[PDB]
Design a protein around this nucleic acid. Structure first.
Ligand SMILES: [Mg+2]
Ligand SMILES: [Mg+2]
Ligand SMILES: [Mg+2]
Ligand SMILES: [Mg+2]
Ligand SMILES: [Mg+2]
Ligand SMILES: [Mg+2]
Ligand SMILES: [Mg+2]
Ligand SMILES: [Mg+2]
Ligand SMILES: [Mg+2]
Ligand SMILES: [Mg+2]
Ligand SMILES: [Mg+2]
Ligand SMILES: [Mg+2]
Ligand SMILES: [Mg+2]
Ligand SMILES: [Mg+2]
Ligand SMILES: [Mg+2]
Ligand SMILES: [Mg+2]
Ligand SMILES: [Mg+2]
Ligand SMILES: [Mg+2]
Ligand SMILES: [Mg+2]
Ligand SMILES: [Mg+2]
Ligand SMILES: [Mg+2]
Ligand SMILES: [Mg+2]
Ligand SMILES: [Mg+2]
Ligand SMILES: [Mg+2]
Lengths: 121, 278, 121, 155, 140, 152
RNA sequence: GCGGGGAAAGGAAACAUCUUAGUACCCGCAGGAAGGGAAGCCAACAGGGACCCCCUGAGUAGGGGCGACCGAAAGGGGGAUA
RNA sequence: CACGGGCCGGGGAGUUCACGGCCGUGGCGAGCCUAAGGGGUUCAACCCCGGAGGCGUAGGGAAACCGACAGCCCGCAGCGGG
RNA sequence: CGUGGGGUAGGGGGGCGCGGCCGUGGGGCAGAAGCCGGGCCGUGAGGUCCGGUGGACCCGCGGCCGACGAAGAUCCCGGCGG
């Protein structure tokens, strides 16, 4: 087939480069794994609904989503979530659940080693 | 709110050119600084050349016309293959007095064209409406950068500031001489001069079909509404496009599929832009 | 009445196949500034008996009387713009009307004054 | 603005009880009698009149009353009347040969069934679809191709 | 002419040797047939192709083993990097130690004179001044 | 969006265009017939791969009957969790009337004709539905609301 | 455009029912368009409201060596409105 | 000792549509897209409207009819501890 | 880093050329395209320059689109040989 080329979006390309550099600098394999998951082909990119966070996260958890966060279902926990992109409904639900929405570089700057950060796909 | 729009990659990635300021400088008819206005949200969109190229290609491909050949071309002769045994190749040949002459095959002189263009062919590349509006917002954001406009090839050394915005009184100018004075005082006359001197006779067969002159693009003028006198005042300049703000499109926002066009916005058009393409 | 189509094939077809009453319009030539101040018009169709100044070509600067006009070729023979053939006979150079300026007007024709008044109006 | 009649889309058994509204052909005679006009007066005023309809909708009645009040108070101009303004009848040549008499109509099936269901209509419709390569006629065997592909991809 | 570091001098000498020994890449019977005499290399995918199979005594096929050294690839034989110049404004941004000027083939004599005078006053090695330009400058 | 070169560009110069030299590009005999044919003679192996052994049901044969669609109902059910999300959105938008001290939902107005029992109910709401499942009615009762069965 | 008469080649990997196709073609008859058009209708107990044409319903119902393959209508959105 | 070309010039062959499967990217995302068509325009471009309808959100059964998860274990990555 | 370096059918990756379009930068009567011979560059498709001929158009770069590449079909048309 036409082999995987990588994203055509320069924002995504720069974010992947940022994550690889951060992983190399801080010796944090989490950023390398997140970059590998974000680099995936568009037909198999990670998308997570907010309802899955209800199961896979408890209160006070820091979660990184290597892809888009979509607003589906109901959220009843308070969680800090970082993602490549967030839909308006997902951001609204995360906010009224008491949680926070961050960019992945913002999460990296706040926690350089990513200690306690949970990958959610 | 626009944190995902402005992705800060510090410290491992050094930042690029600064985003457009929170306010926009406004200039009068005399080219002087007059006031400020709040920057519309459209100028905070990141510049995305791939999306701009896709939207521009869609807008340009919607313009092409269907082309074809005569449906019976090369096929209406009275011909037939005479089989083997005559010492000659078994392609179809003329039946009558011109008998041995080859006929109807794509390798024969006068024969049919094997795979000609068909008028039913789909030339238009459709684009989603939200995608097209996102590309338009990206191109508008690209106009506010000096680097993108220079990379496209405009002369912006003399322009006071980008995004370039003029007062709403400029829409009353109804004469080409007055509009040229306004361009001269605002620093766009060098780019109009570049277009006027860079018009050329293009190479090839376009001259016979009505494409003799290939003219560059100089300045896109944005007014608030249709039928303002400034449109008729400026529309005769070489390479200058003038549209009302609601008629903005990729064909004027990114000629050649490349972002960053030297744009003169009126202040009223900048106010009107806040509820469009969003 | 000469095509308004922007296609060069239609433009050239109209120019080549224009009948004589249309080809008369192609004999228009600029008047001199003195003739313009005298008559109130800027262009007039070149007529036999007019005096014109040749503005281009080998015979540039030569002023003479128009001896012949050919509507079919859209050409004019100007006195002085001549040469000799191999047998010695003198022949006129065919000059396009757009390359001359009218410096004298032959106004003995009543219709010409009507055209002049129409253009001055 | 001349009001447009609002009617109920017919509630089919397939729908299961979901009902919606649509633009009707014209105002009903009961609705017009509610405001004091007959079909002739309404058509003279330019309203669309549907003498066949039996329903009477209060929203239609209110819109009619409002617009008629503007019309009578002169704040609105009624359109031209909803009646035939032209009468163009062509001379008929060869009706028997083109099958337009009663016997021809009976043989073409217009006495018994609808024009859309007559056989000549079916022939012309399928011919036009095949010539233009329209909706289903762009591919021959489309249903069988779909059936086999669904079997293969849903096994 | 252009001074190079020692590895670049050795690579340039090696590239000269490889250019001397490089075979000309022709199809089978190109010498025999006039209809294919001027054609470029064609890697013909046929049943009995012997050039592709590299039989001894036959012509040789195009391979990446014949590639010349990358550090001096594409350089002018003098060692300079050639830059195509179509007007005297093209000379801006060029380094005369590293770059040589090749005037465009369709540049007229009037512009060629200005290009040659500007390049020589700037110190550039002009590869192709032209016979007419050479005669005019000799006459000057 | 990405763009790719056509295969014919690669195939120029190759004689057979990817069809091979032994089994060249021929007419419908190379496909084993025109259209969807051969499935009981030489594509029966395909039928045994994808369909039922013995009968080869989905390729060949009849099974059962169809109830007429013009007399059957086309159902548009909605589960209780999705209904809870919808009523949350409606209450935020002001589309809900708390008529009896509780939220009131009309499935027919919303475009649904049946209530199912998937998900969770969290608020007392009254639902007007022509059909409701047992678990749906029980979960609505647990929430404190009530289901009212309307007649079509 | 309207009415009538009316194939085969090919496909079905043979072939006859079938399809191709009411097509090619033939006979007759009109207009600038033709034909259609004003409920012995459709629906289902709630209601639409002459007709034609476009998008859809939909390759769904259904027809068929139930194979190849063929194939609606009601309903909805428009053009127009008498 | 298999067939084709006397030579040279020019011409000479995987196209398009519909439907389906898949892949590479892009937009939006429990939702996505409008079709016909309508308004405007610097007039086949372009801007706006148009959600009819299609697909997804629930399956099982010939049909009548009924209608759905966070409990436990293993464990890659990752994170934490030695 | 590799006890890496053959390869038909076929699968995958990149590049050259031809006609046009969207941009951008230029050359041309002090001589464009085309043609003849030659030097240089590139593994190569090919590029570029020199001299002669010629007499008005043409080209570099980025993007896009095709009626896009011949040595052969007892190939077609034309010209011309032993
Ligand atoms: Mg032809
Ligand atoms: Mg295309
Ligand atoms: Mg050419
Ligand atoms: Mg069909
Ligand atoms: Mg062999
Ligand atoms: Mg030359
Ligand atoms: Mg095969
Ligand atoms: Mg075999
Ligand atoms: Mg073969
Ligand atoms: Mg069998
Ligand atoms: Mg049975
Ligand atoms: Mg056939
Ligand atoms: Mg058969
Ligand atoms: Mg047979
Ligand atoms: Mg009519
Ligand atoms: Mg009639
Ligand atoms: Mg039929
Ligand atoms: Mg043989
Ligand atoms: Mg032979
Ligand atoms: Mg190998
Ligand atoms: Mg190019
Ligand atoms: Mg070959
Ligand atoms: Mg011959
Ligand atoms: Mg002879």
């Amino acid at each position: 087939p036409p082999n995987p080329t990588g994203p055509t979006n320069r924002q995504l390309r720069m974010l992947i480069r940022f994550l690889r550099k951060a992983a190399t600098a801080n010796s944090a394999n989490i950023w390398r794994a997140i970059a590998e998951l974000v680099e995936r082909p568009r037909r198999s990119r990670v998308v997570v609904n907010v309802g899955k966070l209800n199961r896979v996260a408890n209160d006070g958890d820091v979660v990184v989503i290597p892809g888009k966060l979509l607003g589906g279902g109901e959220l009843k926990k308070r969680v800090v979530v970082a993602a490549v992109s967030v839909t308006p409904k997902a951001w609204k639900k995360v906010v009224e659940a008491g949680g926070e929405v961050l960019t992945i570089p913002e999460l990296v700057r706040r926690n350089p080693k990513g200690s306690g950060v949970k990958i959610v796909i | 709110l626009l944190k995902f729009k402005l992705l800060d990659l510090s410290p491992y990635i050094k930042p690029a050119e600064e985003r457009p300021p929170e306010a926009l400088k406004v200039y009068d008819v005399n080219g002087q600084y007059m006031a400020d206005i709040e920057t519309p949200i459209h100028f905070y969109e990141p510049v995305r050349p791939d999306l701009i190229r896709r939207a521009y290609l869609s807008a340009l491909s919607a313009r092409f016309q269907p082309k074809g050949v005569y449906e019976g071309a090369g096929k209406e002769h009275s011909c037939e293959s005479f089989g083997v045994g005559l010492g000659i190749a078994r392609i179809p040949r003329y039946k009558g007095h011109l008998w041995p002459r080859g006929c109807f095959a794509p390798n024969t002189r006068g024969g049919r064209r094997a795979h000609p263009p068909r008028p039913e062919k789909k030339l238009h590349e459709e684009i989603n409406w939200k995608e097209k509006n996102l590309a338009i917002r990206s191109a508008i954001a690209a106009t506010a950068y000096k680097s993108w406009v220079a990379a496209r090839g405009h002369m912006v050394e003399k322009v006071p500031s980008l995004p370039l915005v003029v007062s709403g009184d400029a829409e009353k100018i109804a004469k080409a001489k007055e509009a040229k004075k306004l361009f001269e005082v605002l620093g766009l006359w060098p780019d109009v001069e570049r277009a006027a001197e860079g018009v050329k006779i293009r190479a090839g067969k376009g001259k016979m079909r009505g494409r003799r002159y290939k003219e560059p693009k100089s300045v896109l003028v944005v007014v608030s509404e249709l039928d303002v006198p400034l449109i008729g005042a400026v529309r005769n300049f070489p390479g200058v496009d003038v549209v009302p703000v609601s008629h903005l499109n990729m064909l004027v926002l990114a000629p050649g599929g490349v972002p960053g066009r030297l744009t003169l916005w009126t202040a009223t058009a900048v106010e009107r832009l806040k509820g469009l393409f969003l | 009445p000469f095509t308004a189509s922007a296609q060069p094939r239609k433009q050239r077809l109209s120019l080549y196949a224009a009948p004589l009453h249309l080809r008369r319009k192609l004999l228009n030539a600029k008047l001199s500034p003195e003739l313009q101040k005298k008559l109130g018009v800027k262009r007039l169709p070149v007529r036999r008996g007019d005096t014109v100044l040749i503005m281009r070509g080998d015979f540039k600067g030569v002023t003479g009387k128009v001896v012949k006009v050919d509507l079919k070729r859209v050409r004019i023979f100007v006195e002085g713009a001549t040469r000799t053939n191999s047998r010695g006979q003198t022949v006129y150079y065919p000059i396009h009307p757009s390359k001359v300026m009218i410096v004298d007007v032959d106004l003995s024709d009543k219709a010409r004054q009507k055209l002049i008044e129409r253009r001055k109006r | 603005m001349i009001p447009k009649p609002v009617v109920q889309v017919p509630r089919s058994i397939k729908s299961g009880g979901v009902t919606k509204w649509k633009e009707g052909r014209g105002f009903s005679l009961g609705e017009l009698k509610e405001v004091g006009l007959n079909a002739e007066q309404a058509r003279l005023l330019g309203l669309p009149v549907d003498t066949r309809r039996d329903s009477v909708w209060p929203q239609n009645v209110e819109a009619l009353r409002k617009w008629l009040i503007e019309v009578l108070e002169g704040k609105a101009t009624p359109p031209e009347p909803t009646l035939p303004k032209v009468v163009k009848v062509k001379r008929k040549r060869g009706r028997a040969f083109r099958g337009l008499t009663s016997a021809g109509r009976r043989s073409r099936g217009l006495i018994s069934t609808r024009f859309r269901e007559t056989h000549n209509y079916k022939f012309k419709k399928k011919a036009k679809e095949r010539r233009l390569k329209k909706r289903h006629e762009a591919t021959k065997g489309l249903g069988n191709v779909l059936r086999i592909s669904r079997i293969i991809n849903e096994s | 002419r252009r001074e190079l570091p020692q590895p670049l001098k050795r690579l340039l000498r090696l590239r000269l040797q490889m250019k001397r020994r490089k075979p000309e890449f022709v199809r089978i019977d190109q010498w025999r047939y006039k209809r294919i005499e001027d054609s470029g290399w064609r890697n013909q995918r046929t049943l009995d192709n012997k050039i592709r199979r590299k039989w001894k005594g036959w012509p040789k096929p195009v391979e990446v083993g014949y590639r010349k050294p990358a550090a001096v690839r594409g350089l002018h034989p003098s060692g300079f990097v050639e830059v195509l110049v179509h007007r005297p404004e093209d000379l801006a941004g060029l380094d005369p130690k590293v770059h040589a000027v090749r005037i465009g083939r369709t540049v007229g004599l009037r512009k060629r004179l200005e290009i040659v005078k500007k390049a020589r006053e700037l110190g550039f090695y002009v590869l192709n001044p032209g016979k007419e330009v050479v005669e005019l400058l000799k006459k000057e | 969006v990405r763009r790719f070169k056509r295969a014919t560009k690669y195939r120029r110069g190759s004689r057979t265009h990817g069809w091979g030299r032994v089994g060249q590009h021929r007419k419908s005999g190379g496909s084993g017939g025109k259209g969807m044919v051969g499935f009981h003679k030489h594509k029966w192996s395909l039928v045994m791969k994808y369909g039922e052994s013995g009968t080869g049901w989905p390729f060949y044969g009849k099974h059962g009957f169809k109830q007429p669609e013009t007399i059957s109902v086309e159902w548009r059910p909605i589960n209780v969790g999705r209904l809870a999300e919808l009523v949350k959105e409606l209450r935020e938008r002001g589309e809900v009337r708390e008529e009896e001290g509780r939220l009131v939902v009309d499935l027919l107005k919303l475009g649904y004709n049946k209530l199912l029992g998937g998900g969770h109910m969290d608020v007392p709401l009254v639902v007007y539905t022509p059909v409701a499942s047992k678990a749906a009615v029980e979960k609505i009762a647990k929430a404190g609301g009530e289901v009212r069965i309307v007649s079509l």
